[PDB]
C-alpha cells in the first residue's frame, strides 16, 4: 500500500474536494474505523456476556438487556459508519462513471457540464453526510441521554418474577470509547459544515 | 483498490449497462452487502443463543425456534444476495467470454451480432434479477408477515411438556436491520424496473 | 480483481475448453463454493451443538449422531468440491507446463502433438469430473436417501441406557441448502455431459 | 511487500524527517504494534475470564473488575497507539495533499513556502506525538501506579455480600508485557525529544 | 493469482525438476494442504470436546486422551507437511540465491558448476523429502496401527478411580480423512521415487 | 508472491550478508514462524483449559498454573521471535535508509563509508541476534529445566485449601514442539556464530 494510491482511494478521485475533505476528514474517517474495529473486537465482544442480571430464571437477562439497549452502541456506530460511507462511495462511483463515459467518448463544451454536475453531486453528497451524522447524533442522544454508559440498572419485565438489578460489565471502558465516537462524529460534522460553506463561497467568488 | 478498477469490476465490464445499473444499483448492492455483513457479524450472531425458551427439558428450545423461524433472516438475505449476484456474475462472464473469443479471432459483421446478443443477455439478466428479488419478497412476506420481528412467542411442541413462552433477544435491532434490507431490496427492484424500461425505449428509439 | 484475469484463472488457461466449461460451469462452481461457505459458516456451524439428544448420560449424543450421520453434509460437499476441483487444477497445471516447456524450447510439428495431448488430457479431465460427481451423487443417496434431512430420530446405542429421541436443529434449513447442492451438482453433471459430447462431435467433424 | 515501499509507507513520504523518525522510531512503532497484537491475541484474551472472584452471587466479579481496572491495559495501549498514529497519519496526508496540489498546479517561489509549511506541520506533529505519549504515561501511572500488575485484590462492592478476594490470572505475564510497553513508549518519547531538538538546531544553523 | 506465476511459485523456479515434481506432486501437495485445512477447520476442531470420557472426576478425560493419542492426527500431518515443505523451500532458496549471485556477478565455466551443484542439491532435496515421508509413515503406523481410528476405548489411569470407557466423536469421519492423508502421502512417496530414478537415468544417459 | 521478491524481502536487501544469513537461517526463521503459528493455533490453544486442577474452590487452578508457568512456552517463543526479528528489521531499515539518502543525493568516496558502516551495522545486528537467542536459551532453561514439559504437578497455594494435583493436557505434544523450538533456536545460534566468524575472516583477508 503506497501513500499516493491510498490517498487516491480515500479521496474518491474527486478534483472538487479541497484539503478538508481529502485530508482531515479522511483521517477522521480512518480513526473512527479503527476505534470501531477495536470496540467490536474487544470492548463490545458479543455484548451479552458483558450484561449479567442477578437472576436464575432464564430469559429475564436477555429481555432486560433488550429493553435497556434497543440498539447496541458499537453496531449503531457501524450503521452510522456505513450510512456516512455511502455518500462518498456514491460520489466516487459518479466521478469514476464520468471517467468511463469520457474515455468511451474519446474513441468516438461537455466537459464544463460534467464538471458542474460533479460539483453539484459532491455538494449534495456532503449535505447527505452531514444530515446522516446529525440523525445519528439525535438517535444516540434519545437512546442514550448520558454520554457515559450506565453502570447498574433496575429492570422488571414479565419473565422476571420481580424487579432485579443488572450490571453492565465495562461502563467506564464503554464510556471512553463512546466519548471518542462522539468526538470523532462531532469533528466530522463540523468538517462537513466547513466543506459546505467553503464550496459555496468558492462558487460565489467564481461569479 | 482504485476507483476506476473497482467500478470496472462492479459494472461487469458491460457497455450496454447505463448509469442506473453501473452506479446506483451498484451502490445499493454494496450497501446491502455491508449491512448483511454487519447483521451476520453481530446482530444475528449464531442466532440460537439469542432465542431462549423458558424451559429446562432439552430440545424444546431448538424445535420451537425451528418452527417459528424456518429460515433465518440473515441467511435468507445471504441466499437472496447470492441469487441476485448470479445474473451479474453470469453476464459479466458472458461479456468476458466474447472478449476472449474476439481476441482469439483477431489473430486468425460479427461485431454487430455480438453486441445484439450481449444486449439480449443483459436484458434477461436484469429480468432474472427482478424475478429473484420479487420471489424473495414473497418468501420473506409469507415466512414473516410483519416487518418488525416478533418479540415474544408461545410454542407447544412434542418435546415441550406444555405450552411455553420463548423470547427473541433483539426484536428491535433485528427489526431495524430487516427494515434496511426491505428498503434496499425494494430500491433494487425499482432500479431493475427502470433499467428494463429504459433499455426497451432505447431499442424502440433505435428502430 | 479484474474480470479478464479472473476469467483467465477460472478457465484454466485452456484453449480447447468451449463456452460451457469456461462460463456456465465456472459460474456453477463459484455458486457451489459460495453456498458451501455459507453452509459451513452458519447453517452447519460445528454441527454438534445442532444435534441434541434427550439424555443425561454422557456419550450417547455423540455416538447417536455418528451412527445417523457417518459423514456430515457440508464436509461431504467440501470433499466433493475438492475432488471435482482436482481435475481442473491438474489440467491447468498441464497447459501451464506445456507453456513453460514451449517457452524453454523457444530459446533453444511439435505444436500439433502438444495441442492433441492437451485436448485428450482435457477430455479425460472432464470425464474424471463427471465420474467424481456421479460417485458423490451415489454416496449422498446411500448415506441420506431422502433429500430433506430428517428432523427427529430414534437411537439406541450401547452407552444409551435405552432408546432415546434426538433432534436435528435445522432440518428445514439444511434441507434448503441440500437442495441447492443437489441442483448445483446435477447442473454440473449435465454440463460435463454436454462438454464431453460437444468435444466428441467437434473431433468427428474435424475428420 | 518490498522494503523500499514499506519504508516509503512508514516514513510518511516526508523529506524533512531525518534518520531517527524514519528508521528507529519506525522500528519502535512496528515493535509496539506487534507486542500489542500478541497481548490482545493471547495474554489479554477477553480479559474477563482471566479475572476470577471467589464468590457465587452474580455481578460481584464484573463490578470488582471494573473498579480495579477502569481501563484495560491492552486497550489503553491500543488507544495510545491510535492517538500517536494520528499525527503521522495527518502529516502524511498533508505532504500527500501538497503532492496532489503541486501536480495539479503543474498542468496549469511557492515551493519554498510549501517546504516551510511542511516543516512546521511536521514539527507540531512530533510535538503532538510527544504530548500524547506523555499524557498516556501519566494516565497509566495514575490508573496503575506499580509497573507490575497486582496479583490478588480485595474488593467489597454493593452486589458483593461482603469483602471478597479476586485473582488476576497472569500478573507476571501481564507485568512482562507492561514492561515492554513502558520501555517502548519511553523510547518513543526520547526519540521524539531528539527529533524536536535536532530539527530546531537544523533551523537555527540554517539562519 | 495467475496460473503461470502460481506454477512458477510452486515449481520453486527450478529448471532441473521435470514434469512429475512440477505438476503431479505439486497437485498432490496442494490437495494435501486443502485436506489438512478442512480437517483442522471442522473434523479435528479442538479435538478435545470430540473425546468424551464417561466420568465425573476431573482430569481423567484429558489424561486418557493423552495416553491414547500421544500426537493428534491433524497436527502430525501438519508437522509432516512442514517437514516435507522444508526441502522444497530450501532448494527454491538455493536457486534464488544463485540467481542473485549470478545477477551480482553480471555487473562485475562457472555456469556449468552452478548447474551441477543445483542438480545435486535438488536430488538430495527429493531424497530428504522421501526420507521424511517414510519416517512419518512409520511414526503414524506405530502410533496408530489401524488406518481406521478406534471408536471406543478403555482407559484406567491414576486420576480415574477405575477403568472407564471413552468415545471418539467421529471415528468414521476421521477414518476417511486419514485414508486420504495416507493415500496422498503414499502417492507423494512414489512420485519422489520416480523423480529420483528419472534424474539418475538422465545423468547416466548424459555420460 | 514470487521467489525472487520473497528472497529479496527476507534477505533484508543487504549485500554484505552471505549465503548462510540469506538462505539457511532465513529458512530456519520461516520454519520457526510456522511451528510457532501451529503451536499457538492448536497445541497451546488458550493454554488454560489445557491445565486442569483437581479442585472445586475457584481460583486455585489459575494461581497454580501461574506459579508453575510464569511465562507460557508459546508466548515466550513469540517474544523470542520478535526480539530476534528486531535486528533484521532494524538493519533492513538501515540499508533502505542509505538507499533513500543515496537516491536523494544523486539528484543533488562517500560510498565506501556507506559500505563500511553498513557492514559494521550488520555485524552488530548479528551479534545482537546471537545475544538475544542465548538470553532466551537461559530464560527457557531456568523457567523450564527439563526439555520435556512436566505432565502432573503438585501445588499448594493460599486459595487452595490443601495440596492438590494438576494435569497438563498435552505434555507429550508440547514436548515435541518444545524440542523443535529448541533445535531451531540452537541452529539459529550456530548459524549466527558461523556468520560472525565468516565476516571477521573476510575483513581480515581484505587487509
Ligand atoms: C471523505 C472521505 C472520508 C471519503 C473516504 C471514502 C470511503 C467512504 C471509501 C474509500 C475506500 C472505500 C472502500 C473501497 C473498497 C471496498 C470493497 C468493497 O467490496 C466493500 C466496500 C469497500 C471497503 C469501500 C467502502 C467505502 C470506502 C472506505
Ligand atoms: C449490477 C451490479 C450490482 C453488478 C455487481 C456485480 C457483482 C454481482 C459481482 C462484482 C464482483 C464479483 C465478485 C468478483 C470475484 C469474486 C471471487 C470469487 O472467488 C467469488 C465470487 C466473487 C466475490 C464475485 C461475486 C460477484 C461480484 C460481487
Ligand atoms: C471448469 C472450471 C470450474 C475450472 C475452475 C478451476 C478451479 C478448479 C481452480 C481455478 C482457481 C484455482 C485456485 C487457484 C489458487 C489456489 C491457491 C492454492 O494455494 C490452493 C488452491 C487454489 C485455491 C486453487 C484451487 C483450484 C481453483 C479454484
Ligand atoms: C514516525 C512513524 C512511526 C510513522 C509511521 C506511520 C504510521 C502511523 C502509518 C504508516 C502506515 C499507516 C497505515 C496505512 C493504511 C492504513 C489503512 C486504513 O484503512 C487504516 C489505517 C492504516 C492501517 C494506516 C494507519 C497509520 C499507519 C500505520
Ligand atoms: C515440489 C513442490 C510440491 C514444491 C512446492 C513448494 C512449496 C513447498 C512452497 C511453494 C510456495 C511456498 C510458500 C511461499 C511463501 C510463504 C510465505 C512465508 O511467510 C511462509 C511460507 C510460505 C507459505 C511458503 C511455504 C513453502 C511453499 C508452499
Ligand atoms: C536473517 C533473516 C531471518 C532476516 C529475515 C527478516 C525478517 C526478520 C523480516 C523480513 C520481512 C519482515 C516483515 C515485513 C513486513 C512486516 C509488516 C509490518 O506491518 C509488521 C512487521 C512485518 C511482518 C515484518 C517483520 C520482520 C520480517 C519478517
Separation of CA A171 and ligand 5 centre (Å): 47
CB E168 within 8 A of CB E61: no
CA distance E29 to E92: 16
Question: E152: part of which helix (H) or strand (E)?
Answer: strand E152-155
Task: Locate B112 and state its grid cell.
Answer: 454487430
CA E57 to chain centre: 38
B29 lines ligand 2 (CB under 6 A): yes
CA distance E175 to E149: 5
C2 interaction partners in chain E (CB closer than 8 Å): none
Interface test with D, best of F22, F96, F117 (most D CBs within 10 A): F96
CB E45 within 8 A of CB E151: no
As a residue count, chain C comes to 207
How many Cα atoms are found within 13 Å in the side-chain-facing hemisphere of F133? Answer: 25
CB E172 within 8 A of CB C66: yes
Closest ligand to residue A82's CA: 1
CA distance F61 to F166: 8
Work out which ligand 2 atom sits closest to the CA atom of B26.
3
DSSP label of E150: P
Coil/strand/helix, residue C69: coil
CA distance A162 to D105: 72
Long-range Cβ pairs for the range E117-121 (8 Å, 24+): E118/E14, E118/E15, E118/E16, E118/E94, E119/E16, E119/E199, E119/E203, E121/E91, E121/E94
CA F102 to chain centre: 33
CA angle B147, B149, B154 (to 5 degrees): 130
D45 torsion bin: left (phi>0), alpha (psi -120 to 50), beta (else) = beta
Task: Locate B121 and state its grid cell.
Answer: 443477455
Closest ligand to residue A192's CA: 1
Task: Locate C40 and state its grid cell.
Answer: 459451513
Question: C144: part of which helix (H) or strand (E)?
Answer: none
Alpha-helical runs (H) found in F69-170: 73-107, 110-143
CA angle D138, D143, D147 (to 5 degrees): 80
Closest ligand to residue A10's CA: 1
Distance from CA of F165 to the nearest CA of E (A): 9
Distance from CA of C198 to the nearest CA of E (A): 26
CA angle A68, A72, A73 (to 5 degrees): 110
CA angle A165, A166, A171 (to 5 degrees): 130
Torsion of CA D46, D50, D55, D57, to 10 degrees: 0
D93 vs A27, A52, A151: nearest CB:
A27
- The residues, any chain, with a CB within 8 Å of residue C185's CB and separated by 6 or more, are C32, C80, C133, C136, C137
CB C185 within 8 A of CB C136: yes
CA angle C89, C91, C96 (to 5 degrees): 95
- The residues, any chain, with a CB within 8 Å of residue C84's CB and separated by 6 or more, are C129, C132, C133, C188
Question: D164-167 and D152-155: which strand pairing?
Answer: antiparallel
DSSP label of F147: S
CA B125 to chain centre: 14
Sheet containing E52-53, strands listed edge to edge, beginning at the edge strand earlier in sequence: E52-53, E164-167, E152-155
- Indicate contact of B with E: 3+ CB pairs under 8 A: no
Backbone angles phi, psi at E60, to 5 degrees: -70, -40
CB E35 within 8 A of CB C75: no
Torsion of CA C178, C184, C188, C194, to 10 degrees: 120
Coil/strand/helix, residue A159: coil
CA angle E29, C28, C21 (to 5 degrees): 75
Nearest CA among A167, B160, B193, A25 for reference residue D60: A167
Backbone angles phi, psi at D156, to 5 degrees: -145, 95
E62 vs F2, F52, F176: nearest CB:
F52
DSSP for chain D, written as a single string: --HHHHHHHHTTT-SS--HIIIIIHHHHHHHHHHHHHHIIIIITSSSSTT-EES--STTHHHHHHHHH-SS-HHHHHHHHHHHHHHHHHHHHHHHHHHHHHHHHHHH--HHHHHHHHHHHHHHHHHHHHHHHHHHHHHHHHHH--SSSPPSEEEE--TTSSS-EEEE-S-HHHHHHHHHHHHHHHHHHHHHHHHHHHHHHHHHHHH-
CB A184 within 8 A of CB A32: yes
Who lines ligand 6 at CB under 6 A?
A: D 1, 6, 30; F 9-10, 12, 21, 25-26, 29, 85, 88-89
Exposure string for D156-166, b = 16+ CB within 10 A, e = fewer: ebebbeeebeb
C71 lines ligand 3 (CB under 6 A): no
Torsion of CA E135, E141, E147, E153, to 10 degrees: -140
Interface contact flag, F176 E71, Cβ < 8 Å:
yes
DSSP label of B152: E
Distance from CA of F21 to the nearest CA of E (A): 11
Interface contact flag, F93 D42, Cβ < 8 Å:
no
CA distance C67 to C141: 16
Give Rg (Cα) of chain B.
22
E29 lines ligand 5 (CB under 6 A): yes
Nearest CA among B104, F197, B2, B131 for reference residue A6: B2
CA A117 to chain centre: 26
Task: Provide the 10 A C-beta neighbour count for residue D116.
Answer: 12
CA distance E71 to E78: 11
Neighbours of chain F (3+ CB pairs under 8 A): D, E
The beta strands (E) that lie in B64-183 are given as 152-155, 164-167
CA distance B85 to B159: 40
Distance from CA of A129 to the nearest CA of B (A): 15
Site to probe by mutation for ligand 4, drawn from D18, D28, D88 as the one with most ligand atoms within 8 Å of Cβ, is D88
> What is the 3-state composition of chain A as percent helix, strand, coil, each rounded to the nearest 5?
70, 5, 25
CA D3 to chain centre: 24
CB C25 within 8 A of CB C108: no
CA F100 to chain centre: 30
Residue C119 CB-density burial (10 A; 0-12 exposed, 13-18 middle, 19+ buried): middle
**Whole-number Cα distances in Å, D142 to B197, D46, D69, D139, D146:** 68, 23, 12, 5, 9
Sheet containing B164-167, strands listed edge to edge, beginning at the edge strand earlier in sequence: B52-53, B164-167, B152-155
CA C20 to chain centre: 17
Exposure string for B86-115, b = 16+ CB within 10 A, e = fewer: bbbbbbbbbbbbbebeeeeeeeeeeeeeee
- Name E138's bridge partners: none
Task: Locate F122 and state its grid cell.
Answer: 550488520
Interface contact flag, A7 D96, Cβ < 8 Å:
yes
CA distance E110 to E118: 12
CA angle B36, B39, B42 (to 5 degrees): 145
Task: Locate E54 and state its grid cell.
Answer: 464417561
- Indicate contact of D with A: 3+ CB pairs under 8 A: yes
Nearest CA to ligand 4 atom 22: A30
> Three-state secondary structure along C147-183?
CCCCCEEEECCCCCCCCEEEECCCHHHHHHHHHHHHH
Distance from CA of B127 to the nearest CA of C (A): 18
E17 lines ligand 5 (CB under 6 A): no
CA D156 to chain centre: 33
As a residue count, chain B comes to 207
C122 lines ligand 3 (CB under 6 A): no
Coil/strand/helix, residue A53: strand
Distance from CA of C12 to the nearest CA of B (A): 13
Nearest CA among B49, B44, B71, B58 for reference residue B164: B58
CB F174 within 8 A of CB F168: yes
Nearest CA among E122, E129, E115 for reference residue E193: E129
CA distance E68 to E153: 8
Residue whose C-alpha cell is 460553506: A197
CA distance B90 to B76: 21
Task: Locate C98 and state its grid cell.
Answer: 506445456
CB F93 within 8 A of CB D27: yes
Task: Locate C104 and state its grid cell.
Answer: 524453454
Closest C-chain CA to B160: C54
Task: Provide the 10 A C-beta neighbour count for residue B142.
Answer: 8
Interface contact flag, E7 C58, Cβ < 8 Å:
no
Nearest CA among A44, A78, A34, A41 for reference residue A170: A44
B52 vs A59, A70, A93: nearest CB:
A59
CA distance A103 to A119: 20
CA E25 to chain centre: 12
- The residues, any chain, with a CB within 8 Å of residue A156's CB and separated by 6 or more, are A162, A163, A164
CA angle B29, B35, B40 (to 5 degrees): 125
- The residues, any chain, with a CB within 8 Å of residue F57's CB and separated by 6 or more, are D54, F159, F160, F161
CA distance B12 to B181: 23
Coil/strand/helix, residue B39: helix
Which chain E residues touch C if contact means CB-CB below 8 Å? 1-4, 7, 11, 15, 19, 22-24, 26-27, 30-31, 34-35, 38, 41-43, 45, 49-50, 52-54, 151, 165, 167, 169-173, 176
Nearest CA among E192, E89, E90, E198 for reference residue E133: E192
Backbone angles phi, psi at C13, to 5 degrees: 30, 45
Nearest CA among E34, E14, E195, E23 for reference residue C96: E23
Residue whose C-alpha cell is 472426576: E57
How many Cα atoms are found within 13 Å in the side-chain-facing hemisphere of E118? Answer: 20
CA distance F25 to B60: 59
CA distance B116 to D167: 74
Interface contact flag, B97 C167, Cβ < 8 Å:
no
CA distance B156 to B64: 8
DSSP for E2-69, written as a single string: -HHHHHHHHTTT-SS--HIIIIIHHHHHHHHHHHHHHIIIIITSSSSTT-EES--STTHHHHHHHHH-
Closest ligand to residue E36's CA: 3
Work out which ligand 5 atom sits closest to the CA atom of E87.
8
- The residues, any chain, with a CB within 8 Å of residue F49's CB and separated by 6 or more, are E48, F169
**Whole-number Cα distances in Å, C6 to A179, B173, D158:** 44, 38, 62
CB D154 within 8 A of CB D50: no
Question: What is the stated resolution of the deposited model, in angstroms?
Answer: 3.5
Give Rg (Cα) of chain D.
22
Task: Provide the 10 A C-beta neighbour count for residue F102.
Answer: 12
C88 lines ligand 3 (CB under 6 A): yes
B92 interaction partners in chain C (CB closer than 8 Å): 3
CA D45 to chain centre: 20
Closest ligand to residue E125's CA: 5
Task: Locate B155 and state its grid cell.
Answer: 410454542
CA distance C45 to A149: 34
Coil/strand/helix, residue F77: helix
Work out which ligand 3 atom sits closest to the CA atom of C129.
1
Where are the domains positioned within chain C?
Answer: 1-207
Question: A164-167 and A52-53: which strand pairing?
Answer: antiparallel
CA distance C25 to C10: 10
- The residues, any chain, with a CB within 8 Å of residue D29's CB and separated by 6 or more, are D10, D85, D188
Amino acid at each position: 500500500m503506497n501513500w499516493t494510491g491510498l490517498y487516491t482511494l480515500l479521496s474518491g478521485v474527486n478534483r472538487h474536494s479541497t484539503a478538508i475533505g481529502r485530508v482531515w476528514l479522511s483521517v477522521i474517517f480512518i480513526f473512527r474505523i479503527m476505534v470501531l474495529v477495536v470496540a467490536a473486537e474487544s470492548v463490545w465482544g458479543d455484548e451479552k456476556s458483558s450484561f449479567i442480571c442477578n437472576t436464575l430464571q432464564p430469559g429475564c437477562n436477555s429481555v432486560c438487556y433488550d429493553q435497556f439497549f434497543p440498539i447496541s452502541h458499537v453496531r449503531l456506530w457501524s450503521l452510522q459508519l456505513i450510512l456516512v460511507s455511502t455518500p462518498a462511495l456514491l460520489v466516487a462511483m459518479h466521478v469514476a462513471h464520468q471517467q468511463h463515459i469520457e474515455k468511451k467518448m474519446l474513441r468516438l463544451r461537455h466537459k464544463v457540464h460534467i464538471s458542474g454536475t460533479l460539483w453539484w453531486t459532491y455538494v449534495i453528497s456532503v449535505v447527505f453526510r452531514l444530515l446522516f451524522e446529525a440523525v445519528f447524533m439525535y438517535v444516540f442522544y434519545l437512546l442514550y441521554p448520558g454520554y457515559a454508559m450506565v453502570r447498574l440498572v433496575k429492570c422488571d419485565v414479565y419473565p422476571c418474577p420481580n424487579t432485579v438489578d443488572c450490571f453492565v460489565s465495562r461502563p467506564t471502558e464503554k464510556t471512553v470509547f463512546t466519548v471518542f465516537m462522539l468526538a470523532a462524529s462531532g469533528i466530522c460534522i463540523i468538517l462537513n459544515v466547513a466543506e459546505v460553506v467553503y464550496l459555496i463561497i468558492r462558487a460565489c467568488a467564481r461569479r
